[PDB]
Design an enzyme around this catalytic site. Structure first.
Site, PDB file in Angstrom:
ATOM      1  N   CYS A 108       5.124   2.203   1.437  1.00 57.05           N
ATOM      2  CA  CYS A 108       5.125   0.795   1.570  1.00 57.05           C
ATOM      3  C   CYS A 108       6.952   0.130   1.844  1.00 57.05           C
ATOM      4  O   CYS A 108       7.635   0.543   1.345  1.00 57.05           O
ATOM      5  CB  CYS A 108       4.827   0.154   0.113  1.00 57.05           C
ATOM      6  SG  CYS A 108       5.106  -1.730   0.503  1.00 57.05           S
ATOM      7  N   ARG A 111       8.560  -3.001  -0.460  1.00 60.23           N
ATOM      8  CA  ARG A 111       8.922  -2.989  -1.633  1.00 60.23           C
ATOM      9  C   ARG A 111      10.032  -3.631  -2.535  1.00 60.23           C
ATOM     10  O   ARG A 111      10.259  -4.037  -3.433  1.00 60.23           O
ATOM     11  CB  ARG A 111       8.866  -1.547  -2.276  1.00 60.23           C
ATOM     12  CG  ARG A 111       7.730  -0.631  -2.223  1.00 60.23           C
ATOM     13  CD  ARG A 111       7.807   0.563  -2.827  1.00 60.23           C
ATOM     14  NE  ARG A 111       8.397   1.434  -1.322  1.00 60.23           N
ATOM     15  CZ  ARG A 111       8.943   2.669  -1.405  1.00 60.23           C
ATOM     16  NH1 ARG A 111       9.205   3.400  -2.632  1.00 60.23           N
ATOM     17  NH2 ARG A 111       9.315   3.272  -0.441  1.00 60.23           N
ATOM     18  N   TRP A 280       1.589  -9.654   2.254  1.00 61.70           N
ATOM     19  CA  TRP A 280       1.199 -10.283   3.641  1.00 61.70           C
ATOM     20  C   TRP A 280       1.664  -9.232   4.467  1.00 61.70           C
ATOM     21  O   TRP A 280       2.303  -8.231   4.361  1.00 61.70           O
ATOM     22  CB  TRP A 280       2.250 -11.603   3.761  1.00 61.70           C
ATOM     23  CG  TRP A 280       3.573 -11.200   3.198  1.00 61.70           C
ATOM     24  CD1 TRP A 280       4.889 -10.737   4.040  1.00 61.70           C
ATOM     25  CD2 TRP A 280       4.557 -11.518   1.945  1.00 61.70           C
ATOM     26  NE1 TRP A 280       5.792 -10.509   3.483  1.00 61.70           N
ATOM     27  CE2 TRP A 280       5.778 -11.101   2.192  1.00 61.70           C
ATOM     28  CE3 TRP A 280       3.838 -12.224   0.791  1.00 61.70           C
ATOM     29  CZ2 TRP A 280       6.556 -11.348   1.375  1.00 61.70           C
ATOM     30  CZ3 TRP A 280       4.970 -12.452  -0.221  1.00 61.70           C
ATOM     31  CH2 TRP A 280       6.109 -11.965  -0.105  1.00 61.70           C
ATOM     32  N   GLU A 285       1.658  -4.121  12.201  1.00 63.34           N
ATOM     33  CA  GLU A 285       0.417  -3.517  11.810  1.00 63.34           C
ATOM     34  C   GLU A 285      -0.694  -4.292  12.549  1.00 63.34           C
ATOM     35  O   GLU A 285      -1.624  -3.566  12.895  1.00 63.34           O
ATOM     36  CB  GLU A 285      -0.070  -3.851  10.104  1.00 63.34           C
ATOM     37  CG  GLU A 285       1.380  -3.532   9.275  1.00 63.34           C
ATOM     38  CD  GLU A 285       0.935  -3.968   7.967  1.00 63.34           C
ATOM     39  OE1 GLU A 285      -0.073  -3.350   7.304  1.00 63.34           O
ATOM     40  OE2 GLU A 285       1.559  -4.868   7.377  1.00 63.34           O
TER      41      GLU A 285
HETATM   42  C1  HEM Z   1       4.613  -8.222   0.078  1.00 62.58           C
HETATM   43  C2  HEM Z   1       4.335  -8.050   1.370  1.00 62.58           C
HETATM   44  C3  HEM Z   1       4.067  -6.701   2.226  1.00 62.58           C
HETATM   45  C4  HEM Z   1       4.249  -6.029   3.219  1.00 62.58           C
HETATM   46  C5  HEM Z   1       5.208  -6.672   4.502  1.00 62.58           C
HETATM   47  C6  HEM Z   1       4.071  -4.570   2.999  1.00 62.58           C
HETATM   48  C7  HEM Z   1       4.010  -3.768   3.995  1.00 62.58           C
HETATM   49  C8  HEM Z   1       3.437  -2.424   4.258  1.00 62.58           C
HETATM   50  C9  HEM Z   1       3.390  -1.942   5.512  1.00 62.58           C
HETATM   51  C10 HEM Z   1       3.896  -2.271   6.698  1.00 62.58           C
HETATM   52  C11 HEM Z   1       2.481  -0.587   5.064  1.00 62.58           C
HETATM   53  C12 HEM Z   1       2.007   0.299   6.084  1.00 62.58           C
HETATM   54  C13 HEM Z   1       0.736   0.043   6.495  1.00 62.58           C
HETATM   55  C14 HEM Z   1      -0.016   0.676   7.586  1.00 62.58           C
HETATM   56  O1  HEM Z   1       0.583   1.337   8.283  1.00 62.58           O
HETATM   57  O2  HEM Z   1      -1.328   0.566   7.903  1.00 62.58           O
HETATM   58  C15 HEM Z   1       2.377  -0.811   3.659  1.00 62.58           C
HETATM   59  C16 HEM Z   1       1.426   0.273   2.917  1.00 62.58           C
HETATM   60  C17 HEM Z   1       1.343   0.436   1.447  1.00 62.58           C
HETATM   61  N1  HEM Z   1       1.601  -0.658   0.679  1.00 62.58           N
HETATM   62 FE1  HEM Z   1       2.861  -2.449   1.168  1.00 62.58          FE
HETATM   63  N2  HEM Z   1       3.609  -4.598   1.903  1.00 62.58           N
HETATM   64  C18 HEM Z   1       3.590  -5.398   1.091  1.00 62.58           C
HETATM   65  C19 HEM Z   1       2.973  -5.777  -0.121  1.00 62.58           C
HETATM   66  C20 HEM Z   1       2.270  -4.797  -0.841  1.00 62.58           C
HETATM   67  C21 HEM Z   1       1.759  -4.910  -2.285  1.00 62.58           C
HETATM   68  C22 HEM Z   1       1.810  -6.078  -2.992  1.00 62.58           C
HETATM   69  C23 HEM Z   1       1.275  -3.432  -2.820  1.00 62.58           C
HETATM   70  C24 HEM Z   1       0.652  -2.975  -4.036  1.00 62.58           C
HETATM   71  C25 HEM Z   1       0.945  -3.905  -5.112  1.00 62.58           C
HETATM   72  C26 HEM Z   1       1.527  -2.675  -1.427  1.00 62.58           C
HETATM   73  C27 HEM Z   1       1.303  -1.086  -1.502  1.00 62.58           C
HETATM   74  C28 HEM Z   1       1.251  -0.433  -0.625  1.00 62.58           C
HETATM   75  C29 HEM Z   1       0.677   0.905  -0.553  1.00 62.58           C
HETATM   76  C30 HEM Z   1      -0.182   1.702  -1.731  1.00 62.58           C
HETATM   77  C31 HEM Z   1       0.738   1.493   0.652  1.00 62.58           C
HETATM   78  C32 HEM Z   1       0.057   2.428   1.172  1.00 62.58           C
HETATM   79  C33 HEM Z   1      -1.584   2.347   1.949  1.00 62.58           C
HETATM   80  C34 HEM Z   1      -2.077   3.442   2.375  1.00 62.58           C
HETATM   81  O3  HEM Z   1      -1.652   4.535   2.227  1.00 62.58           O
HETATM   82  O4  HEM Z   1      -3.296   3.500   2.652  1.00 62.58           O
HETATM   83  N3  HEM Z   1       2.148  -3.387  -0.536  1.00 62.58           N
HETATM   84  N4  HEM Z   1       2.701  -1.935   3.227  1.00 62.58           N
HETATM   85  C1  LIG Z   2      -0.918  -4.579   0.405  1.00 61.92           C
HETATM   86  C2  LIG Z   2      -0.925  -4.434   1.783  1.00 61.92           C
HETATM   87  C3  LIG Z   2       0.304  -5.007   2.392  1.00 61.92           C
HETATM   88  C4  LIG Z   2       0.489  -5.044   3.984  1.00 61.92           C
HETATM   89  N1  LIG Z   2       1.332  -5.384   5.023  1.00 61.92           N
HETATM   90  N2  LIG Z   2      -0.391  -3.977   4.566  1.00 61.92           N
HETATM   91  C5  LIG Z   2      -1.394  -3.434   4.030  1.00 61.92           C
HETATM   92  C6  LIG Z   2      -2.425  -2.422   4.886  1.00 61.92           C
HETATM   93  C7  LIG Z   2      -2.234  -1.070   4.601  1.00 61.92           C
HETATM   94  C8  LIG Z   2      -3.635  -0.350   5.108  1.00 61.92           C
HETATM   95  C9  LIG Z   2      -3.557   1.168   5.356  1.00 61.92           C
HETATM   96  C10 LIG Z   2      -4.841   1.963   5.869  1.00 61.92           C
HETATM   97  O1  LIG Z   2      -4.594   3.089   5.789  1.00 61.92           O
HETATM   98  C11 LIG Z   2      -5.526   3.951   6.481  1.00 61.92           C
HETATM   99  C12 LIG Z   2      -5.631   3.599   8.015  1.00 61.92           C
HETATM  100  N3  LIG Z   2      -4.198   4.309   8.533  1.00 61.92           N
HETATM  101  C13 LIG Z   2      -3.891   5.234   7.850  1.00 61.92           C
HETATM  102  C14 LIG Z   2      -5.064   5.306   6.568  1.00 61.92           C
HETATM  103  C15 LIG Z   2      -4.142   5.926   5.474  1.00 61.92           C
HETATM  104  C16 LIG Z   2      -5.240   5.707   4.400  1.00 61.92           C
HETATM  105  C17 LIG Z   2      -6.283   6.911   3.825  1.00 61.92           C
HETATM  106  C18 LIG Z   2      -7.311   6.580   3.041  1.00 61.92           C
HETATM  107  C19 LIG Z   2      -8.377   7.563   2.420  1.00 61.92           C
HETATM  108  C20 LIG Z   2      -7.356   5.454   1.948  1.00 61.92           C
HETATM  109  C21 LIG Z   2      -6.338   4.374   2.285  1.00 61.92           C
HETATM  110  N4  LIG Z   2      -6.049   3.322   1.689  1.00 61.92           N
HETATM  111  N5  LIG Z   2      -5.420   4.848   3.318  1.00 61.92           N
HETATM  112  C22 LIG Z   2      -1.437  -3.279   2.601  1.00 61.92           C
END
Ligand code: HEM
Ligand SMILES: Cc1cc(N)nc(CCCCCO[C@H]2CNC[C@H]2Cc2cc(C)cc(N)n2)c1
Ligand code: HEM
Ligand SMILES: Cc1cc(N)nc(CCCCCO[C@H]2CNC[C@H]2Cc2cc(C)cc(N)n2)c1
Ligand SMILES: C[C@H](O)[C@H](O)[C@H]1CNc2nc(N)[nH]c(=O)c2N1
Ligand SMILES: C[C@H](O)[C@H](O)[C@H]1CNc2nc(N)[nH]c(=O)c2N1
Ligand SMILES: [Zn+2]
EC number: 1.14.13.39
Lengths: 404, 402
Positions: A108, A111, A280, A285
Site C-alpha cells: 500500500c 500508508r 481513495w 490504478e
Molecule cells: C487513503 C487512500 C489510499 C490510497 C491512495 C491507497 C493506495 C493503494 C494503491 C495504489 C494500491 C495498489 C493497488 C493495485 O495495484 O491494484 C494499494 C494496495 C493495498 N492497500 Fe492501499 N490505499 C489507500 C487506502 C487504503 C486503506 C484504507 C487500506 C486498509 C485499511 C489499504 C490497504 C491496502 C492493501 C491491503 C493493499 C494490497 C491489495 C492487494 O494485495 O490486493 N489501502 N493501496
Molecule cells: C483500499 C484501496 C485503496 C486503493 N487506492 N486501491 C485499492 C485497490 C486494490 C485492489 C487490488 C486488486 O488486486 C488483484 C488485482 N491485481 C493484483 C491482484 C492481487 C490480489 C490477489 C488476490 C487473490 C486478492 C487480492 N485482494 N489481490 C484499495
C-alpha cells in the site's frame, strides 16, 4: 553499520538500517538461493503466542507495557483460550489492530494516512441481510458525496466448526464482464468469474460495459444471498479530457470508491474473513491499469487512433502518449467532479514522508517495491530510487481462498 | 520445491528448475526480501573449474569424450601444481557469452549468442590496454551499426595487483563540482572527473566533455589516455516536431560500454573485461537526462513546452519525459545509430524468456531492472513474474580500485 538490512536511497545518497524486520514472525517467499519478490501470490498454543504478542503490541501502543492492566489482559486472554479455544478483542484493541494491519501492508502506497481510519465494528452481525445494511452504511460514510474517508467494517471472526462470513465479490464496486459468443468480453474481463457466479445465483444480467455488479454475501453455513446496490449509493465519474473534446464521447467512467472485500484481516491469531476496507484511488490504478491493461478494458489503441498517433511502430511511443492522456483525463474528471483522488507524484512523495516517519517510530517499514512504484513514469517518482525491505508483520491483511 | 512463475496477462505458468543450479547466494532470506537492493583454497577453485569445463563440453555436445577427460586432467594438474589455471580461447568465448546470458539485470539477452570476444590476455601494460580498448570501440561502434563486444584482459593472479579500468564506462561525460556544491555536466561522474584531473588531465568546462581513461597495470599508478575524438560517436538530440528542442544543446554517446565489472568464469576472475552493446532509449531519455541526480532536464523541457509546472496533477513530468524519449529515438534513427525502444526491447525479452524455458528450464531475471523506468505496465514484462538468482559464469560488481 549494524547487522540489519542496509537500505539506500540512490537519489539522495542516504542510508538507513531496517531493525523492524526482526519483529517479523512469518516467512515470505524468498530464500538465499532465489528471490521470489515479483510473485503476486507468495491452533491451541499457536493461538496463545500470537495473542500474547498482539496484546503486548496494544499495551505498548498505549504506553502501559508492563502495567497491571497489561498483565491482567494477558491472563484474561489465556483463560478464555484455555476454556473456549478462542478469545475476543476489546473494541479499542480491534481499532488498533485494524490500523496496524493497514500500517503493516507492504503493497500500500497510501500508508501516510494509516492513523486516520474509521473502524466500524460489525461483530454483532448475524445474517446476510444485516451484512448488506452494514455494507451500505460503510459505502455511504466512506463516499461522503465525493469527500472520501478511509474506513473498514469488521464482521464476526472465524469460529471453530462454524462457517465463515464471506463477501464473494473482490471489491464492493465491480463492473460486469460478459463473455461473448466470439470469446471476447464486454465490460471488465477481471470480473468474468464473479459475473457468471452472480447469474448462477439468480441475477438478471445487463449488457453494458459498466454494469455495476450485485453483492454476493454469505452468512455462516448459508448459501450466499444476492443484493443489488441502490444506484444512488455508487458514486461514479464520467471521464472527459481537459483539451481533447472527443474523449468524453468515449463514454468511459469509473467509480469513486475502491473497496477491497475479499481479504482476511488477521489480528492476534483471530481471523476476520469478512472485513472490507476502502480508501481513495491513486489515478494510475484507474487510468493506467484498469483502462489500459491488455487483459482489462484495453483502451490504448482506441485512444491512440483518436489522437491520430502512429500505432504501427513501437518507436513512435504511441502507447506512452495515449496512456499519459488517459491518466490526465482521470485526474481532471475526478477533480471536476469533486471526488478525492491522488496522482502518482503526490502519492509517492507522501509515501517517502511515511518512510521517514516509520524509520523514527519503528525503525523500518515493510514495502513491496514492485507494487509501490507506479505503473507509468516509475523513475520520475522518488520511490523508484528508494530500496525497500519486504516482510510480513502482524496484524495483517492476507489473501484467502475463494469461498466456492 | 521449484518456483511457480506466472504471467498475469496471459494466465500461463512455468516452473523454474534452472535455479537449482545456483551455488552463490542472493541478499534475501525467508524473514525478509532484499531484491530491490542495487548492491547485494584449491578444491573450491577445482570444483568451479570442473563444473565450467563440464558446461563447455556439454555446449559442444562432446560431453564425456576423450577431449573432455583430457581437459579435466590438464585443469586438475595445473591447479594442483600452481594454485590456478588458464582458459583456452574457445572456453573463454563460451564463458563470456554465458556470463551475459546469465546476467539477471539485462533486458538485451535475446542477443546473447552474438558477441564478439577479443582476447586481450597478452596485455602487459596500460599502453597496450589502451590500444586494445581503441580497437574494441572502433569495432563495436562500426560507424553506427553497433555490434556487441567484450575485451578480456589478463585474469587476477594471487601474487599481484589487478589490471583495472578506473572509469565505470568507456565513454563518460565529466562532472565539475561548483564551489556551491552544484555540478556542471554529469553528476554521476564527479569522482572519476576529480581523479582524472588529479592524475594530470586538463579539464574542460562544458556539460558534455568526454573523459579520458584511467588505465591500471598491476601495482602501477593508473595512466591517463585521451580517446581520439573520432572514435567516440555522439548523437546531437533534436525532436521530430518541437523545433526549440535542438536549441537545448543536448547530446549522448552511441556506445554503452561497462568497464568496471568483474567477469568470473570457472573460478577465474577477469577484473578488466569491458563489454558493450547498444542502448535502450529509456537509459538515455529517462534515466541519464531526467534523473534528478543526473542531468535533471525535466523542468527545462516542461517550461519550453509551456506546461503547467505548478502542480503535479497536470502530469507535466510525464509529458516532458515522453517527448525527451521520443527525441532520443528520433535523433538516433536520424543519425543511423543502433538503438532499441523499451517496447521492442521488452517484447524481445519475452521471447528470450520462452527460448530459455525450453533450453534451460528457466531464466534469472531481476524484475526491478527489467521493467523500464517509464510506461512499466504498458510493456509485457511488467506482468511477468521473475526469479532472480546467480549463475556462473557471471558479471559481478567489484570494489573501486582507489
Ligand atoms: C487513503 C487512500 C489510499 C490510497 C491512495 C491507497 C493506495 C493503494 C494503491 C495504489 C494500491 C495498489 C493497488 C493495485 O495495484 O491494484 C494499494 C494496495 C493495498 N492497500 Fe492501499 N490505499 C489507500 C487506502 C487504503 C486503506 C484504507 C487500506 C486498509 C485499511 C489499504 C490497504 C491496502 C492493501 C491491503 C493493499 C494490497 C491489495 C492487494 O494485495 O490486493 N489501502 N493501496
Ligand atoms: C483500499 C484501496 C485503496 C486503493 N487506492 N486501491 C485499492 C485497490 C486494490 C485492489 C487490488 C486488486 O488486486 C488483484 C488485482 N491485481 C493484483 C491482484 C492481487 C490480489 C490477489 C488476490 C487473490 C486478492 C487480492 N485482494 N489481490 C484499495
Ligand atoms: C545488445 C544490446 C544490449 C541492450 C539493448 C542491453 C540492455 C540493457 C539495459 C537496459 C540494462 C539496464 C541498464 C541500466 O539500467 O543502467 C542492461 C544491464 C546489463 N547488461 Fe545488457 N544490453 C545489451 C548488451 C549487453 C552485453 C553485450 C552484455 C555483456 C556482454 C550485457 C550485460 C549487462 C550487465 C552485466 C548489466 C548490469 C549492469 C549493472 O549492473 O550495472 N548487456 N543491459
Ligand atoms: C552492455 C550495455 C548495454 C546497455 N544498453 N547499457 C549498458 C549500461 C549499463 C549501465 C550500468 C550503470 O549502473 C550503475 C549506475 N546505476 C545503477 C548502478 C549499478 C552498478 C553499481 C556498481 C558498483 C557497478 C556497476 N557497473 N553498476 C551496458
Ligand atoms: C508480475 C508482477 O509482480 C505483477 O504484474 C505486479 C507488478 N506490480 C504491481 N503493482 C501494483 N500496485 N499492482 C499490481 O497489481 C502489480 N502487479
Ligand atoms: C532502488 C532501486 O532498486 C533502483 O532505483 C533500481 C530500480 N530499477 C532499475 N532498473 C534499471 N534498469 N537500472 C537501474 O539503475 C535501476 N535502479
Ligand atoms: Zn527477494
Amino acid at each position: 553499520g549494524p547487522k540489519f538490512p542496509r537500505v539506500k536511497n540512490w537519489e539522495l545518497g542516504s542510508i538507513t538500517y531496517d531493525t523492524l524486520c526482526a519483529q517479523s514472525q512469518q516467512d515470505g517467499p524468498c530464500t538465499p538461493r532465489r528471490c521470489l519478490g515479483s510473485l503476486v501470490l507468495p491452533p491451541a498454543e499457536q493461538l496463545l503466542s500470537q495473542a500474547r504478542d498482539f496484546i503486548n503490541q496494544y499495551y505498548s501502543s498505549i504506553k502501559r507495557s508492563g502495567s497491571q492492566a497489561h498483565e491482567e489482559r494477558l491472563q484474561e486472554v489465556e483463560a478464555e483460550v484455555a476454556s473456549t479455544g478462542t478469545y475476543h478483542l476489546r473494541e479499542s484493541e480491534l481499532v488498533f489492530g485494524a490500523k496496524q494491519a493497514w500500517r503493516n501492508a507492504p503493497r500500500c502506497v497510501g500508508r501516510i494516512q494509516w492513523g486516520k481510519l474509521q473502524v466500524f465494528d460489525a461483530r454483532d452481525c448475524s445474517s446476510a441481510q444485516e451484512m448488506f445494511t452494514y455494507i451500505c452504511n460503510h459505502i455511504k460514510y466512506a463516499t461522503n458525496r465525493g469527500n472520501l474517508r478511509s474506513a473498514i467494517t469488521v464482521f464476526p471472526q472465524r469460529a471453530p466448526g462454524r462457517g465463515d462470513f464471506r463477501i464473494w465479490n473482490s471489491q464492493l464496486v465491480r463492473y460486469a464482464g460478459y463473455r461473448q459468443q466470439d470469446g471476447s468480453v464486454r465490460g471488465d474481463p477481471a470480473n468474468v468469474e464473479i459475473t457468471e457466479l452472480c447469474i448462477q445465483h439468480g441475477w438478471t444480467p445487463g449488457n453494458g460495459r459498466f454494469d455495476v455488479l450485485p453483492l454476493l454475501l454469505q452468512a455462516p453455513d448459508e448459501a450466499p444471498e444476492l443484493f443489488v446496490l441502490p444506484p444512488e449509493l455508487v458514486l461514479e465519474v464520467p471521464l472527459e479530457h481537459p483539451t481533447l473534446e472527443w474523449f468524453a464521447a468515449l463514454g468511459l467512467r469509473w467509480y469513486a470508491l475502491p473497496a477491497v472485500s475479499n481479504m482476511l484481516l488477521e489480528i492476534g491469531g483471530l481471523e476476520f474473513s469478512a472485513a472490507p476496507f476502502s480508501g481513495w484511488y491513486m489515478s494510475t490504478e484507474i487510468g493506467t491499469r484498469n483502462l489500459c491493461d491488455p487483459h482489462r478494458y484495453n483502451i490504448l489503441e482506441d485512444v491512440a487512433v483518436c489522437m491520430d498517433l502512429d500505432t504501427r511502430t513501437t518507436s513512435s511511443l504511441w502507447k506512452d502518449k495515449a496512456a499519459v492522456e488517459i491518466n490526465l483525463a482521470v485526474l481532471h474528471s475526478f477533480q471536476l467532479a469533486k471526488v478525492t483522488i491522488v496522482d502518482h507524484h503526490a502519492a509517492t512523495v507522501s509515501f517517502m514522508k511515511h518512510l521517514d516517519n516509520e524509520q523514527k517510530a519503528r525503525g523500518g517499514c515493510p514495502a513491496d517495491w514492485a507494487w509501490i512504484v507506479p505503473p507509468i513514469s516509475g523513475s520520475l517518482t522518488p520511490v523508484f530510487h528508494q530500496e525497500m525491505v519486504n516482510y510480513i508483520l502482524s496484524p495483517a491483511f492476507r489473501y484467502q481462498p475463494d469461498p466456492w
